[PDB]
Amino acid sequence: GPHMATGQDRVVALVDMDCFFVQVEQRQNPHLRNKPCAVVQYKSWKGGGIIAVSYEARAFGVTRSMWADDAKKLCPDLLLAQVRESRGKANLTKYREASVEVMEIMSRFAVIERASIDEAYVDLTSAVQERLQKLQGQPISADLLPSTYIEGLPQGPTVQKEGMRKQGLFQWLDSLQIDNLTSPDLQLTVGAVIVEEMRAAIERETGFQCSAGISHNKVLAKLACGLNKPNRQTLVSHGSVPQLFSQMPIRKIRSLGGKLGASVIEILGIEYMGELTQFTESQLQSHFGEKNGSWLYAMCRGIEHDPVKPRQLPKTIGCSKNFPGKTALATREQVQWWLLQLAQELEERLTKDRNDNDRVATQLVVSIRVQGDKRLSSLRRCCALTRYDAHKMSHDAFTVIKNCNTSGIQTEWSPPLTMLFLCATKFSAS
DNA sequence: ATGATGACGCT
DNA sequence: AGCGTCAT
Numbered sequence: 001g002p003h004m005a006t007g008q009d010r011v012v013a014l015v016d017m018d019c020f021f022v023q024v025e026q027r028q029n030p031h032l033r034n035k036p037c038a039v040v041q042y043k044s045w046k047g048g049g050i051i052a053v054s055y056e057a058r059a060f061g062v063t064r065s066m067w068a069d070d071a072k073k074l075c076p077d078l079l080l081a082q083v084r085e086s087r088g089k090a091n092l093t094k095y096r097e098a099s100v101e102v103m104e105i106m107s108r109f110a111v112i113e114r115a116s117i118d119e120a121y122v123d124l125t126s127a128v129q130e131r132l133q134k135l136q137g138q139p140i141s142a143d144l145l146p147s148t149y150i151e152g153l154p155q156g157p158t159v160q161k162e163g164m165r166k167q168g169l170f171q172w173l174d175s176l177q178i179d180n181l182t183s184p185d186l187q188l189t190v191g192a193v194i195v196e197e198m199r200a201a202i203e204r205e206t207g208f209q210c211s212a213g214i215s216h217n218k219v220l221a222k223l224a225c226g227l228n229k230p231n232r233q234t235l236v237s238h239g240s241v242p243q244l245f246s247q248m249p250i251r252k253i254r255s256l257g258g259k260l261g262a263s264v265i266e267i268l269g270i271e272y273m274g275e276l277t278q279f280t281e282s283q284l285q286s287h288f289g290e291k292n293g294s295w296l297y298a299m300c301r302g303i304e305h306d307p308v309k310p311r312q313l314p315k316t317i318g319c320s321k322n323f324p325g326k327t328a329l330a331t332r333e334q335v336q337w338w339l340l341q342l343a344q345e346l347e348e349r350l351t352k353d354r355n356d357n358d359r360v361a362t363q364l365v366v367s368i369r370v371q372g373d374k375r376l377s378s379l380r381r382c383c384a385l386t387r388y389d390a391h392k393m394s395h396d397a398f399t400v401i402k403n404c405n406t407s408g409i410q411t412e413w414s415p416p417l418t419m420l421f422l423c424a425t426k427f428s429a430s
Numbered sequence: 431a432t433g434a435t436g437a438c439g440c441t
Numbered sequence: 442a443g444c445g446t447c448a449t
């Protein structure tokens with residue numbers, strides 16, 4: 001009752017760019033705009049691997065991981081943009097720089113947590129409180145929420161998508177208590193107004209469209225963002241959670257998409273997030289551990305406490321290349337040349353990072369895979385990163401992995417290497 | 431022969 | 442430290 005927390009203390013938004021890599025290429029090349037198109041890397045094996053897909057192309061069944069030769073069988077007019085290749089490997093610099101453009105814009109509105117190349121969480125609690133004061137109780141016009149969906153509405157006693165959307169928005173606004181400044185539903189609505197403004201600024205200043213979710217925590221904001229894509233935003237209120245979760249497959253909630261979520265389903269004999277409410281917290285802790293059990297107990301009620309962490313820059317800077325099947329590295333010369341290739345790209349990115357961001361990495365992580373292992377990584381070793389010098393970094397990487405060579409011959413490498421990875425970590429201010 | 435990333439938990 | 446999970 002009066003002491004039962006409802007997890008309505010914050011306003012959190014998740015902003016996610018639509019078909020990011022595709023939009024980056026379509027901004028650069030206007031011939032790709034408003035067309036079925038995809039982004040592909042490499043080209044020789046089966047036309048290249050598709051890594052991003054425009055919504056027009058998704059209508060034909062094109063998906064990520066598809067070989068482009070196979071995507072062309074579903075969508076013969078599919079247009080393709082190729083990832084840049086430098087020093088023999090895919091180079092994602094264009095997308096990292098486009099990401100910085102977006103993140104710097106969102107940072108004007110609030111402190112962000114950079115979750116990925118194209119996603120950021122925003123804690124809007126303070127900004128909402130401010131905007132509510134600037135209001136002083138005037139109602140919020142539907143005109144301020146032109147691309148907002150209210151999940152769960154319309155409901156109660158038109159056949160077009162936008163008609164639905166407006167009907168739900170009208171019901172939501174008509175029931176709002178704009179007089180109470182601590183009403184959570186009011187706070188979410190003002191949050192959504194701000195997110196409309198943020199999304200308009202991103203589009204105005206970059207050309208890029210995005211979707212967003214607005215709720216009271218990160219999991220609900222992420223789920224919300226996915227409900228109405230592309231180019232729309234969705235508000236998921238605390239009150240909408242019971243119905244939303246009642247048919248929500250457990251795997252759709254962030255962190256439950258893998259083995260843990262599969263075990264929740266199998267051990268408890270359930271399918272949907274809402275079914276978790278019927279277990280005590282101690283029961284869930286007994287099955288899934290103290291941390292996971294408490295998290296599930298709260299999360300299935302719409303409650304989660306993970307803070308939006310103030311972090312706009314990535315914590316690691318890594319360079320990786322696979323050498324699949326027949327191309328696995330079988331000579332010391334090969335291993336050494338590719339370590340140098342990776343190390344040169346890493347040196348370039350590290351020097352740029354140090355000039356831009358006033359920090360220096362202090363640890364170099366080297367990771368390899370040997371032919372035969374089902375695990376993505378077969379060995380990971382660290383060494384000191386004392387100088388931004390590619391030849392030194394590649395020599396140190398070789399020193400820390402060279403005893404993996406089963407070969408009795410000095411020149412050969414066995415088993416051959418199917419993956420090389422160099423990662424700079426443990427940043428210090430400079 | 432998906433590939434190239436990136437954050438965080440466990441021991 | 443080194444490995445694994447989960448995600449873009």
Ligand SMILES: Nc1ccn([C@@H]2O[C@H](COP(=O)(O)OP(=O)(O)OP(=O)(O)O)[C@@H](O)[C@@H]2O)c(=O)n1
Binds near residue numbers: 017019022051118449
């Ligand atoms: N396995 C994956 C995943 C992502 N990505 C990259 O991260 C970007 C954002 O990932 P995403 O949000 O999951 O997908 P999206 O392309 O933005 O499309 P949308 O968000 O559904 O509109 C993609 O554009 C790139 O394809 C990559 O490389 N491999």
Ligand SMILES: [Ca+2]
Binds near residue numbers: 018118
């Ligand atoms: Ca996206």
Ligand SMILES: [K+]
Binds near residue numbers: 119
């Ligand atoms: K994303």
